[PDB]
Design a protein around this motif. Structure first.
Motif, mmCIF file in Angstrom:
data_model
loop_
_atom_site.group_PDB
_atom_site.id
_atom_site.type_symbol
_atom_site.label_atom_id
_atom_site.label_comp_id
_atom_site.label_asym_id
_atom_site.label_seq_id
_atom_site.Cartn_x
_atom_site.Cartn_y
_atom_site.Cartn_z
ATOM 1 N N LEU A 20 -7.077 -13.514 -17.846
ATOM 2 C CA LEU A 20 -6.496 -12.979 -16.623
ATOM 3 C C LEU A 20 -5.151 -13.584 -16.333
ATOM 4 C CD1 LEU A 20 -9.663 -13.548 -14.339
ATOM 5 C CD2 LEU A 20 -9.188 -11.668 -15.937
ATOM 6 N N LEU A 21 -4.232 -12.761 -15.836
ATOM 7 C CA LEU A 21 -2.952 -13.254 -15.335
ATOM 8 C C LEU A 21 -3.047 -13.338 -13.812
ATOM 9 C CD1 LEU A 21 -0.341 -14.163 -16.574
ATOM 10 C CD2 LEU A 21 0.569 -11.846 -16.326
ATOM 11 N N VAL A 22 -3.006 -14.556 -13.277
ATOM 12 C CA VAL A 22 -3.269 -14.795 -11.857
ATOM 13 C C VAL A 22 -2.076 -15.370 -11.104
ATOM 14 C CG1 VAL A 22 -4.821 -15.904 -10.207
ATOM 15 C CG2 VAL A 22 -5.638 -15.403 -12.533
ATOM 16 N N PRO A 23 -1.296 -14.498 -10.447
ATOM 17 C CA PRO A 23 -0.237 -14.984 -9.554
ATOM 18 C C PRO A 23 -0.866 -15.615 -8.318
ATOM 19 C CG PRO A 23 0.113 -12.671 -10.207
ATOM 20 C CD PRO A 23 -1.295 -13.028 -10.576
ATOM 21 N N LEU A 24 -0.482 -16.840 -7.984
ATOM 22 C CA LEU A 24 -1.030 -17.468 -6.792
ATOM 23 C C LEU A 24 -0.180 -17.098 -5.592
ATOM 24 C CD1 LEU A 24 -1.985 -20.991 -8.245
ATOM 25 C CD2 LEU A 24 -3.398 -18.931 -8.016
ATOM 26 N N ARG A 25 -0.826 -16.554 -4.560
ATOM 27 C CA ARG A 25 -0.104 -16.059 -3.392
ATOM 28 C C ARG A 25 -0.242 -17.018 -2.206
ATOM 29 N NH1 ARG A 25 -0.813 -9.404 -3.901
ATOM 30 N NH2 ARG A 25 -1.135 -9.440 -6.181
ATOM 31 N N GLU A 26 -1.143 -16.718 -1.279
ATOM 32 C CA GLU A 26 -1.277 -17.545 -0.070
ATOM 33 C C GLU A 26 -1.799 -18.967 -0.312
ATOM 34 O OE1 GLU A 26 -0.395 -17.372 3.148
ATOM 35 O OE2 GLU A 26 0.822 -15.644 2.597
ATOM 36 N N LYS A 27 -1.183 -19.928 0.374
ATOM 37 C CA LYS A 27 -1.602 -21.321 0.291
ATOM 38 C C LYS A 27 -2.912 -21.535 1.040
ATOM 39 C CE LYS A 27 3.040 -23.151 -0.364
ATOM 40 N NZ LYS A 27 4.267 -23.753 0.224
ATOM 41 N N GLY A 28 -3.677 -22.537 0.611
ATOM 42 C CA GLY A 28 -4.913 -22.872 1.286
ATOM 43 C C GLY A 28 -6.077 -22.970 0.328
ATOM 44 N N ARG A 29 -7.252 -23.279 0.870
ATOM 45 C CA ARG A 29 -8.457 -23.437 0.067
ATOM 46 C C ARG A 29 -9.303 -22.170 0.066
ATOM 47 N NH1 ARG A 29 -10.801 -29.431 0.432
ATOM 48 N NH2 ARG A 29 -12.708 -28.204 0.061
ATOM 49 N N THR A 30 -9.645 -21.704 -1.132
ATOM 50 C CA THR A 30 -10.434 -20.492 -1.283
ATOM 51 C C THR A 30 -11.454 -20.680 -2.412
ATOM 52 O OG1 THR A 30 -10.286 -18.059 -1.436
ATOM 53 C CG2 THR A 30 -8.845 -19.330 -2.871
ATOM 54 N N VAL A 31 -12.132 -19.597 -2.799
ATOM 55 C CA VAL A 31 -13.212 -19.683 -3.783
ATOM 56 C C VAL A 31 -13.139 -18.617 -4.882
ATOM 57 C CG1 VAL A 31 -14.844 -20.794 -2.186
ATOM 58 C CG2 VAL A 31 -14.755 -18.261 -2.356
ATOM 59 N N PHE A 32 -13.847 -18.872 -5.979
ATOM 60 C CA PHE A 32 -14.088 -17.876 -7.020
ATOM 61 C C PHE A 32 -15.576 -17.988 -7.318
ATOM 62 C CE2 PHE A 32 -12.252 -21.815 -8.549
ATOM 63 C CZ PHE A 32 -13.255 -22.320 -9.377
ATOM 64 N N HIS A 33 -16.216 -16.872 -7.658
ATOM 65 C CA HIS A 33 -17.659 -16.900 -7.845
ATOM 66 C C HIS A 33 -18.150 -15.634 -8.497
ATOM 67 C CE1 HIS A 33 -18.446 -13.928 -4.599
ATOM 68 N NE2 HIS A 33 -17.377 -14.464 -4.042
ATOM 69 N N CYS A 34 -19.379 -15.690 -9.000
ATOM 70 C CA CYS A 34 -20.014 -14.503 -9.515
ATOM 71 C C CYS A 34 -20.307 -13.556 -8.351
ATOM 72 C CB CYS A 34 -21.323 -14.872 -10.215
ATOM 73 S SG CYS A 34 -22.086 -13.425 -10.928
ATOM 74 N N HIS A 35 -20.092 -12.258 -8.560
ATOM 75 C CA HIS A 35 -20.398 -11.288 -7.511
ATOM 76 C C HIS A 35 -21.760 -10.624 -7.670
ATOM 77 C CE1 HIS A 35 -19.496 -9.030 -3.917
ATOM 78 N NE2 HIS A 35 -18.324 -9.637 -3.844
ATOM 79 N N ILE A 36 -22.581 -11.149 -8.569
ATOM 80 C CA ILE A 36 -24.017 -10.953 -8.367
ATOM 81 C C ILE A 36 -24.331 -11.995 -7.308
ATOM 82 C CG2 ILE A 36 -26.332 -11.192 -9.359
ATOM 83 C CD1 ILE A 36 -24.980 -10.207 -12.041
ATOM 84 N N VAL A 37 -24.479 -11.556 -6.058
ATOM 85 C CA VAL A 37 -24.362 -12.494 -4.947
ATOM 86 C C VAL A 37 -25.479 -13.529 -4.896
ATOM 87 C CG1 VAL A 37 -22.791 -11.178 -3.482
ATOM 88 C CG2 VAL A 37 -25.265 -10.702 -3.406
ATOM 89 N N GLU A 38 -26.633 -13.191 -5.461
ATOM 90 C CA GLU A 38 -27.696 -14.179 -5.615
ATOM 91 C C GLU A 38 -27.228 -15.377 -6.447
ATOM 92 O OE1 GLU A 38 -28.008 -10.940 -5.814
ATOM 93 O OE2 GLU A 38 -29.753 -10.351 -4.611
ATOM 94 N N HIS A 39 -26.484 -15.099 -7.517
ATOM 95 C CA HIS A 39 -25.933 -16.168 -8.359
ATOM 96 C C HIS A 39 -24.941 -17.055 -7.589
ATOM 97 C CE1 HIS A 39 -26.856 -13.754 -12.310
ATOM 98 N NE2 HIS A 39 -27.936 -14.054 -11.611
ATOM 99 N N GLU A 40 -24.106 -16.450 -6.744
ATOM 100 C CA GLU A 40 -23.217 -17.236 -5.888
ATOM 101 C C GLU A 40 -24.041 -18.121 -4.961
ATOM 102 O OE1 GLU A 40 -23.082 -15.910 -2.283
ATOM 103 O OE2 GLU A 40 -22.738 -18.046 -1.936
ATOM 104 N N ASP A 41 -25.042 -17.529 -4.317
ATOM 105 C CA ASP A 41 -25.882 -18.290 -3.387
ATOM 106 C C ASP A 41 -26.575 -19.439 -4.105
ATOM 107 O OD1 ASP A 41 -25.392 -16.774 -1.046
ATOM 108 O OD2 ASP A 41 -27.110 -15.459 -1.385
ATOM 109 N N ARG A 42 -26.822 -19.251 -5.398
ATOM 110 C CA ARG A 42 -27.585 -20.209 -6.190
ATOM 111 C C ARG A 42 -26.674 -21.150 -6.969
ATOM 112 N NH1 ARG A 42 -32.496 -21.808 -5.047
ATOM 113 N NH2 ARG A 42 -32.945 -22.210 -7.276
ATOM 114 N N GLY A 43 -25.376 -21.097 -6.667
ATOM 115 C CA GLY A 43 -24.443 -22.125 -7.112
ATOM 116 C C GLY A 43 -23.236 -21.709 -7.934
ATOM 117 N N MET A 44 -23.175 -20.453 -8.359
ATOM 118 C CA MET A 44 -22.133 -20.054 -9.297
ATOM 119 C C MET A 44 -20.825 -19.741 -8.564
ATOM 120 S SD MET A 44 -22.409 -17.307 -12.476
ATOM 121 C CE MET A 44 -22.953 -18.149 -13.973
ATOM 122 N N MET A 45 -20.204 -20.781 -8.023
ATOM 123 C CA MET A 45 -18.997 -20.636 -7.214
ATOM 124 C C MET A 45 -18.227 -21.949 -7.282
ATOM 125 S SD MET A 45 -18.512 -19.283 -3.298
ATOM 126 C CE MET A 45 -19.957 -20.104 -2.603
#
Ligand SMILES: [Cu+2]
Ligand SMILES: [Cu+2]
Ligand SMILES: [Cu+2]
Ligand SMILES: [Cu+2]
Ligand SMILES: [Cu+2]
Ligand SMILES: [Cu+2]
Ligand SMILES: [Cu+2]
Ligand SMILES: [Cu+2]
Lengths: 439, 439
Positions: free
Chosen positions: B408-433
């Motif tokens: 992926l080519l990822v231009p960083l835009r807005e400053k601050g703290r954010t997240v990346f995670h699996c969008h099988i949302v159960e997996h996010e809830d279970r730690g994949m973030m």
């Protein structure tokens, strides 16, 4: 003694170089005067340590100075837990440096103090020596049959039989001396016995530059700071900035006397003047030309052919990060900065990953030349000032003129905390240094 | 009502979309049964918010749930101080999200909960809605004259008139439901009035994939998650993973009834079996084919010509860093990891520089498909599984099959703290973030 003075050599024995060296004020004869210098091993320069890859070095430094000191193994890609720029050896105390010489290594390196705030006066006073890593490449006939010499290029100024003290202007410019010496001798004569010379060159001065040219001859560059080139490179002259090393072949063309000179060079040192409303800074301009030595060619010289090849330069992995480091100055304050900051030993400035490659873009936004040095991790200079470098070899110091950007390929090797800084050592002492942590 | 059910639209007025939405348990009629769902604005799906670049959005969310909640503005490149994945709105309390819609933006986006550990049950229960950013490109005749519809693809399971609870296996796989719905309706009929349809597609399911195919027709992809392609791309089918959006043109070829189906697709969900010494995990295999809607073409369809061009994709600066993020699984524990770690809100995992570009290499070392989502900073997918992507467009979710690497080519835009995670949302809830800090 030999017409050409060179430091005494200490060689590893059976794979081990075990040596105690004292850092001590030492009365000696220098350029014809008696002076007291600060020396390692009672000599100026210190002894040349000669080793091979895989040797063990066990060097016990005894501090006999009235201030703390330490060693930097300049150019050696070893662990910063050994080459520790933060370590202090108090007066009267000793410390043993022990390391193994890396397997893939060859060239001319050196040792000197690196205790922040005290480097410039200690180095200026005489504390330095060379370390040579011998290579199997030295056995090829084109090198083996050459006459080899080390030339330690270091200047000095004396006052009342001791190294001259630093003035405020010295702290701003970096201190240069009127005695421009080779191996601690004033314009020695080198009476060559062979038509091809192999000269290992070290600039161990605080700040003086050497724009090297041998009368009537080109030089053939065969090694840079930290290793061989891929093949010899013919040059008309060769600039060595503080901390740099080079190795060259000289192919004597006819009988006679040839001067090796440091030609005029303007590194942007500054003076002060007052013309009627003035007191302001004004360029010192180019250095005055200096004769370094007299080279006497033998009868009917017939030089060896040049080696066709030296060492192939490693194929590096693609880089994973690009860094930008900008150098600036506050001349009147004698303060010097990297990315707007002065050194702070507690602050980590860059964090990188061992065994990855980085691209470092170093930009000189000052008006003085600044020679940029990185500990522990030798680099490949890709370009400087927008000009591609004409060879591949390992370097660990790169000179930047005013305005220039150097682009470096930096493989990260040993893990740990280390430093990068200007090798005009007064500038380092005055803040132009930062911290890299490799994990 | 209209043969084809679509969520009610709320449009900005005079450049301002000011709206209070409650998150509330809501009795409603769904697929023919009465059920109580968790909704925004009393409907399932929630209302579609329709805005233009430079509009101000002022959305006051009132939490009428018995647990804390929040909003993620999925896909919007706005500040993580607004789209704040760490913010908690307690039961009974309200919070106002206020932001300006970026000038260079177009497409189909959406809103749903993002309170770690509680996303899967809240999303499954009905909390989501679409946000459409209208563009001046919508005025070109080839789009303006098309018949436009939103298709919100979301499945559901009911038990005792409420969303079915999560089982342990649901936490491992991500929960899918037997009611496979479009805009909350069970296999609606779309009676087309024009020969060209413009369909905005949203996969708002927890875990279900939609391998989309319209009988007897190709689809023309004109937008990905976060913006238009450069020109239409003809495809035979189109896989939408959880969180993804797409916009397509459909060019009806002849009169008749055509099924839009979710064809069989194996995302690597697992079951358990015992064959005589067994209890061990065994692949569920491909999903059963589902009919999503019935599409009825008009009399004598003569579709519009396709647009020749859409939006040129921006020329991005050269990247300054390459990142590697490896996804792994512990299926029997229902634990999921990025670089060997589970999410920790206090821990920053990546630190990058705003307005630089990074290359992110995301590697799926698991056996399940994982759709990788990054907040705040839309990306350009260069390749997946070693195959170049056949178009340039902004995306914010990328699906990785077992073993695949996405670059992926990822231009960083807005400053601050954010997240990346699996969008099988159960997996996010279970730690994949993980946590990205941009400064
Ligand atoms: Cu040095
Ligand atoms: Cu060094
Ligand atoms: Cu400097
Ligand atoms: Cu140093
Ligand atoms: Cu989302
Ligand atoms: Cu998101
Ligand atoms: Cu996943
Ligand atoms: Cu998210």
């Amino acid at each position: 003694g030999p017409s050409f003075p060179e430091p005494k050599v200490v060689r590893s024995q059976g794979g081990l170089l075990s040596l105690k060296l004292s850092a001590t004020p030492t009365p000696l004869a220098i350029a014809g005067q008696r002076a007291t210098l600060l020396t390692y091993g009672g000599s100026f320069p210190g002894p040349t340590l000669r080793v091979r890859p895989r040797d063990t070095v066990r060097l016990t430094l005894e501090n006999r100075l009235p201030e703390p000191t330490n060693l930097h193994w300049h150019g050696l890609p070893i662990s910063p837990k050994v080459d520790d720029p933060f370590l202090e050896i108090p007066p009267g105390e000793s410390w043993t440096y022990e390391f193994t010489v890396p397997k893939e290594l060859a060239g001319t390196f050196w040792y000197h103090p690196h205790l922040h705030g005290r480097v410039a006066p200690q180095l200026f006073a005489g504390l330095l020596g060379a370390l040579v890593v011998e290579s199997s490449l030295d056995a090829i006939p084109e090198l083996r049959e050459a006459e080899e010499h080390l030339l330690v290029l270091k200047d000095l100024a004396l006052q009342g039989g001791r190294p001259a003290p630093h003035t405020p202007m010295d702290w701003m410019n970096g201190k240069e001396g009127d005695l421009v010496l080779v191996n601690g001798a004033l314009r020695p004569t080198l009476v060559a016995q062979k038509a091809t010379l192999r000269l290992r060159l070290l600039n161990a001065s605080n700040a003086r530059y050497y724009r090297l040219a041998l009368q009537d001859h080109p030089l053939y560059l065969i090694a840079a700071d930290g290793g061989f080139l891929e093949e010899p490179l013919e040059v008309s002259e060769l600039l060595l900035a503080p901390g740099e090393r080079a190795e060259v072949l000289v192919r004597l063309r006819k009988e006679g006397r040839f001067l090796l000179q440091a030609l005029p060079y303007d590194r942007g040192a500054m003076g002060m003047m007052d013309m009627g409303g003035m007191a302001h800074a004004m360029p010192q301009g180019p250095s005055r030309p200096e004769t370094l030595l007299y080279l006497i060619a033998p009868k009917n010289p017939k030089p060896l052919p040049l080696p066709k090849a030296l060492s192939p330069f490693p194929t590096l992995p693609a880089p994973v990060v690009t860094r930008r480091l900008v150098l600036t100055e506050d001349m009147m304050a004698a303060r010097f900065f990297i990315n707007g900051q002065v050194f702070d030993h507690r602050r980590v400035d860059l964090k990188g990953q061992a065994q990855t490659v980085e691209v470092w873009e170093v930009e000189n936004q000052g008006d003085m030349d600044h020679p940029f040095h990185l500990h522990v991790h030798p680099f490949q200079v890709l370009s400087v000032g927008g000009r591609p470098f004409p060879y591949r070899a390992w370097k660990d110091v790169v000179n930047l003129k005013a305005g220039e950007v150097a682009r470096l390929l930096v493989p990260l090797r040993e893990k740990g905390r280390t430093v990068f800084h200007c090798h005009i050592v007064e500038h380092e002492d005055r803040g132009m240094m930062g911290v890299l942590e490799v994990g």
